[PDB]
């Protein structure tokens, strides 16, 4: 109880500090890696479409 309440307060402080000054960089890294993967996939799709267009041009030649 007493020690339980004290350690509960300690954990509450820990969690608030983590979410107030530690989480943001982690979320930033997650979002940045996700967007890098998405951009790589979009690059793949557009490169495939570019090759298709080049093949169409060749056929037109």
């Amino acid at each position: 109880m007493s020690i339980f309440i004290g350690q509960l307060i300690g954990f509450a402080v820990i969690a608030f500090i983590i979410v107030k000054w530690v989480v943001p960089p982690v979320r930033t890294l997650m979002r940045n890696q996700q967007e890098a993967v998405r951009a790589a996939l979009a690059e793949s799709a557009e490169a495939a479409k570019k090759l298709a267009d080049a093949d169409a041009m060749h056929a037109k030649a």
């Binding site: 790589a40 996939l41 490169a47 570019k50 090759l51 041009m57 060749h58 037109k60």
Partner: protein, 63 residues
Amino acid sequence: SNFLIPNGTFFAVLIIFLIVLGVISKWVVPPISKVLAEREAMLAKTAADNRKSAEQVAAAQAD
């Protein structure tokens, strides 16, 4: 008293640990390696596609 003396858990952990090992070796490492290979192949295909598009444009110009 004298916790440094080992005990039956000396095996139990190992047993449990063994199971964990297998799981990671069955549905974590293999699939993740496959995903990494897929991404690397996708990047290689993208670069090759860009190069081949440039080359094809140049050729079509040449023909």
